[PDB]
């Protein structure tokens, strides 16, 4: 290590990590803790002024004290903590930490259910008449604040997606089959807790269809996560039940139809109509990643038996989602929607923000029944039912002095907008 | 594969007392509040208390203080519940179920008969 | 502290006909959630009670769509659409709000004949 010519002048010698030090009056000078000072070194000269841990805000994980009368209101509900830790670092020196987690018993719950409406979906639409309010009952089992929306999709509106035919146009199906035009997304149904409004809608909407297998629901979902008001978003726990019976076209398919100005990740809805799949790509996976990640979307994936294997990969690179097996005629969605929702509830898996250009982190997770996780898996904790507390190991290392100011970024519980301020301090003089 | 099992038939003596355990299966006990319900013939249903098996969270009727003492054990997913000083009015039938803020006693044990008699 | 009465102690009801049951409160048990904390219980004979509505107007599964719930802040009504030989019991309200938690003496409901 520092057995290696180190010596130079004040902050350098200091600032070579972990044994280095100087003292302020063989093998090497500036290189040992215990080979170093060993060889005559009193203990009121050398200079290694460390890092220290500051928790500056923790209100405490609400526990259930008050009991089954209590009807925790949600801005009271605390279920990471700290909330606002100061760290300061020196460069080598690890400064762990760790993290809270405990599970709530009752949240609040945006639902949107974006589906397919290609006309291999046909069936589907029938079933789905008396599902705002079925879902919104069995919904209400897990939550007192339920909301529900409804968005339609079908494909971009272009040469070679759909067939350009004035008559197809109007008529992308056959003779006696009714349908109505190809279009890209409809928003049906902004967030409401009315249920029957739900099901007086979704019996208006009429079938369409289009011309290759694949969908461009990608343009859909995207509009979903980022059009704010327009969907009706609370700053909530977040679904976006996603459903269809075929694969699904992303960026680099655009270019069939000239398309190749890739998605823009803004909102472009009019009358409730996507206006730009004309002019804009289909979004990349990792597009997607980001916009969901960012609006804290929670996916799921109900699919048919025959388009399983490409979903639950979608859904491997998609953190925080989860996907299940959809009956023919949809018959089963409900209980999909419950089983999806209770895997996505029952584990944490912690995102960090952006850090600096010589700063490192670790995660270490301490499960229920001792099931630990190391480096990737740090940041995991499955098997969490309602109540359980699980904690996080969180180290942070610094290689060298960045910045002279503080990175205050952020770790947040990817679905929950709960976050813990991590404002870090640099030591980068002498004393 | 929800269940609680409470157990058998008692018969006690006036002034004695008694425990009476539920079983939880199907679900993580330590997440849901254990309710206690007694039954009178003639008096309908009345709510005893309330127990979260994790920590020693008790929310009690009044009535009953000092009549009915809960206790829960995690590591056999049980809970109980001790009547003391057993007269004709502890002469019942007694519920365990199962209780959230948000949803109270979906579930509930077939129930245990106490009768006190000399 | 929170009284419910349930003022009728039974009903006879011919097997097809559709019935009220009503549940009345000392205290308005909407609380600021917009939630209504009331449940709807039915006991049939030698059984525990079953859990039947679960927020005023809320239903449990496996309770069939026959049963419907409301009521104002203080004033509760249980419909029940076509009552059949396998909704015979007893009947109770209980209030989920206020400690200590109170039912009221339940409804009986039998067949006419």
């Known amino acids: 290590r520092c057995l290696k010519a180190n010596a130079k002048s004040c902050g350098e010698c200091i600032q070579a990590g972990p044994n280095c030090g100087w003292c302020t009056n063989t093998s090497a000078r500036c290189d040992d803790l215990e080979a170093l000072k060993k060889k005559g070194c009193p203990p009121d000269d050398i200079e290694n002024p460390r890092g220290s841990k500051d928790i500056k805000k923790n209100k405490n994980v609400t526990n259930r004290s008050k009991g089954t009368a209590e009807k925790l209101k949600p801005e009271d509900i605390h279920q990471i903590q700290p909330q606002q830790l100061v760290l300061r670092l020196r460069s080598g020196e690890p400064q762990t930490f760790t993290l809270k987690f405990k599970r709530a018993e009752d949240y609040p719950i945006d639902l949107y259910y974006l589906m397919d409406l290609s006309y291999s979906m046909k069936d589907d639409l029938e079933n789905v008449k008396s599902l705002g309010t079925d879902l919104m009952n069995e919904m209400r089992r897990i939550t007192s604040d339920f909301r529900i929306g409804f968005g339609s999709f079908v494909e971009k509106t272009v040469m070679p997606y759909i067939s350009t035919t004035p008559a197809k146009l109007r008529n992308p199906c056959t003779s006696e089959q009714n349908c109505t035009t190809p279009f890209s997304y409809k928003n049906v149904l902004s967030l409401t807790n009315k249920g029957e409004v739900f099901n007086e809608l979704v019996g208006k909407q009429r079938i369409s269809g289009n011309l290759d297998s694949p969908e461009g629901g990608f343009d859909a979902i995207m509009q979903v996560a980022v059009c704010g008001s327009l969907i009706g978003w609370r700053n909530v726990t977040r679904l976006l039940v996603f459903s269809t019976d075929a694969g699904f076209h992303f960026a680099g398919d655009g270019k069939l139809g000239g398309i190749v100005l890739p998605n823009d990740g803004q909102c472009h809805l009019e009358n409730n109509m996507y206006t730009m799949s004309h002019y804009y790509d289909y979004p990349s996976i990792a597009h997607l990643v980001q916009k969901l990640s960012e609006n804290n979307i929670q996916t799921i994936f109900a699919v048919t038996e025959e388009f399983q294997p490409v979903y639950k990969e979608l859904k491997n690179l998609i953190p925080k989602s989860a996907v299940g097996t959809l009956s023919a005629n949809s018959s089963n969605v409900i209980q999909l929607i419950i089983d999806a929702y209770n895997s996505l509830s029952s584990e944490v898996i912690l995102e960090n923000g952006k850090l600096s250009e010589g700063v490192t982190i670790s995660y270490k997770s301490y499960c229920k029944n001792g099931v630990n996780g190391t480096g990737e898996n740090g940041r995991k904790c499955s098997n969490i039912s309602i109540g359980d507390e699980v904690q996080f190991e969180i180290s942070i290392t610094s290689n060298k002095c960045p910045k002279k100011d503080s990175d205050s970024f952020k770790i947040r519980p990817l679905g929950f907008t709960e976050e813990v301020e991590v404002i870090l301090q640099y030591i980068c003089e002498c004393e | 594969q929800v269940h609680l099992q409470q157990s058998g038939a008692e018969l006690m003596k006036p002034g004695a007392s008694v425990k009476i355990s539920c079983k939880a299966t199907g679900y993580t006990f330590t997440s849901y509040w254990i309710e206690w319900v007694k039954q009178r013939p003639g008096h309908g249903l009345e709510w005893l208390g309330e127990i979260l098996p994790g920590s020693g969270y008790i929310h009690y009727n009044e009535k009953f203080k000092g009549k009915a003492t809960f206790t829960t054990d995690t590591s056999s997913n049980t809970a109980y519940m001790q009547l003391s000083s057993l007269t004709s009015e502890d002469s019942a039938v007694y519920y365990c179920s199962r209780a959230l803020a948000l949803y109270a006693m979906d579930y509930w044990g077939q129930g245990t008969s106490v009768t006190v008699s000399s | 502290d929170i009284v419910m009465t349930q003022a009728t102690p039974s009903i006879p009801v011919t097997p097809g006909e559709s019935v009220s049951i009503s549940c009345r409160s000392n205290?308005?048990?909407?609380?600021?959630?917009?939630?209504?904390?009331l449940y709807w219980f039915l006991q049939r004979p030698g059984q525990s009670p079953r859990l039947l509505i679960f927020?005023?107007?809320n239903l449990a599964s496996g309770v069939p769509d026959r049963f419907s719930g409301s009521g104002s802040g203080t004033a509760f009504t249980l419909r029940i659409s076509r009552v059949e030989a396998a909704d015979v019991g007893i009947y109770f309200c209980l209030q989920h709000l206020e400690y200590p938690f109170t039912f009221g003496a339940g409804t009986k409901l039998e067949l006419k004949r």
């Open positions: 927020r005023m107007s």
């Open positions: 205290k308005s048990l909407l609380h600021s959630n917009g939630n209504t904390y």
